Each structure stands twice: as C-alpha cells, then as structure tokens.
Amino acid sequence: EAEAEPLDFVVATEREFEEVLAISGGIYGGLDYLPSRYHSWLRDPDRTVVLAKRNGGVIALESVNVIDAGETVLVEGLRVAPWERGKGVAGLLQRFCSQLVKRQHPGVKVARLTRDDQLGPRELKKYRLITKQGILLVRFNASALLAGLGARLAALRTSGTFSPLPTEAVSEAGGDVARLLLSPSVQRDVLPGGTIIQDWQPYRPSESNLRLLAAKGLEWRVDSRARPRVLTLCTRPFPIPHGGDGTWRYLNIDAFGSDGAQVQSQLLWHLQRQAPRLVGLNVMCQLFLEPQLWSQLADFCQVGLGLELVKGYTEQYLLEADIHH
Ligand SMILES: NC(=[NH2+])NCCC[C@H](N)C(=O)O
C-alpha cells in the first residue's frame, strides 16, 4: 500500500499558514505558540521553516534556526499531522533538515532542543542533557487577579505569611542585562547550566545572542544588580488557541536562581507588570524554575495568590547533540 505521491520538502511561505494550522490541532494542550508566531518565523534571517508535503498537502513542519554566533542550530515546532503520524514522517523531515543545515551552515557544531516529555533511554543515548528546569503552570483571569491582589497581599503581610522582598530594576537599554548575563559568575551560579532559557529557546550567554534577545520585548527583574542571585525573565504574552474563544494568552516567566523567596517576589512583580495589559483576557502562566523551588512556588501561587494549578510537576529538558558532517 505505497502512497501514490511522494514526500516533498519545501520552504514554508505565508500561503501555507492555514494548511499548517490544520495539522496543529491540540498541540501542547492549547498552549501552542505557532499560530501566533508562524508569520514572524518567516521573517527571521537565520531561520528556515520546512514543510513536508504529500500530493501538495502540508503534513509536517520543522524549523531550524542558527544561533550562538553560528555554532548552534535550534530545532523547534516539529509536528506531523495526526492522520500521518507513526509512519516515520517526523524522522524523514528531521533528516532533510539536518542535511540542509550541514549544507547551508557548515559552521554549526551542535543541535539543541527543549522538551517537556520524559527523557527515555533513546534520548539519553543520542542527546546530552545541558540542564533542566521545573515547570509550574497556573491559570487566572487577569481582571479577577487585579481586583483581588491588594487584599490578598495585605492579608499575607498582616498574617505574617508573606511580605514581598525588595527587587531591583533591570534595563536592557541601560546596559544592565549585559552586565548580568555576560558575568562569568552569574553564568556559573545563576543560569541553569550556564544557559539562558527564554520561552523554551536556549541561548548561550553572549553579546551576539543578547542582540537577539533585545528585539523581543522581554522584561527582566533581579534581586540585586550588585550581588545577583535570582534573575527572572518574562516573555511578552501572545495569543494561544486554548479555550477556542480567542481570549487566552500565554505568559512565560523563566526564573534563574536558588532563592525561592526572591523567585516569589519577582514573580509577583512580573504579574503586577503584565496583568494590566491583559485586562479582559485569560492567562496561562508557566513558570520555569530550579526543580527544588517548585513546591514552594506552587504553594505560593495556590494559597498565597489564589491561582489555579493547571497540572502537576513536569520538567523542561535542554538537550544537545553533535552534528555529523
Ligand atoms: N508545551 C511544550 N511541550 N512546549 C515545548 C516547546 C518547545 C518545542 N521543542 C518546540 O519548539 O515546539
């Protein structure tokens, strides 16, 4: 029962946007970023979005983007249509893209990717684990959160439960981001495996990548610019298909450091910064933090901030594998 027409690998364009959506049903439980990101991906100068087509119909997608000053290729968004899964399509698409990178980007030495699924033996054999972070996913209505937070945080103050610790501002334009991330000691003691993870995307801490990060509208927060120990990072919210009513946004916060109290205070700062912009909308807030801090922050979010836990503990894995020219 051979397929009548063969597989054709071609670079994605804006015309296939609706075809790509048709194969993306239920991806990441409705937290899929590609609906909101597909068009920007096409404008990225170091990125190649590859579609697998059978008889002219899109059935799979993979993106490869060269970062880390040309030494790394990040693999994102790998997906196959539900009705084409289990036939090795994702494997064939992976091989086409690996050859493309080796051909166009001879300087790439490693491939990198992030994932939340359990790392089976296969993974451990083909990939090195650079680092891993815990994942805390909560949901809330922005308006309801704002209307009740003052009372919530006042109770904590008087209750003696919690009082927000001081935090310090971080300005990219002012040069604070560079002075933090280019610090060898911050890279060693703060960053997970010496790596910046921003909305599932890993970057080596380098000026070249800092330029990429600066163009995304990220917001930073730190415990002390002089004595940095906890550094948090918020990605600008964007729409996700969850809910089907178009009201849901994905708020990604990456937390680097081992002081749980500072991760709490800095998470609260980001929430008070971002929720006003989300009035009238619903938010899926995913916090990535050191695994040992998870229970502390899940409680804080649940009991302290009246937030709803969407799912139990899971982990984000940063994987790396060499490129075999
Ligand atoms: N909820 C998740 N599992 N998100 C995974 C995002 C990262 C994934 N490797 C991608 O580029 O699509």
Residue numbers in the entry: 47 to 371
Q: Which sentences did the original study use to describe this structure?
A:
We find that HisAT adopts a double-GNAT (Gcn5-related N-Acetyltransferase) fold where the N-terminal domain binds acetyl-CoA and with distinct active site conformation allowing the binding of histidine in between the two domains. Our results indicate that HisAT catalysis occurs via a ternary complex, and the ternary complex is likely stabilized by the oxyanion hole generated by the residues Gly123 and Leu124 of the β-bulge.
The crystal structure with arginine had the substrate residue occupying a very similar position to histidine. The missing waters could also be explained by the comparatively poorer diffraction quality of this crystal. The crystals of the P63 space group invariably contained a CoA disulfide.
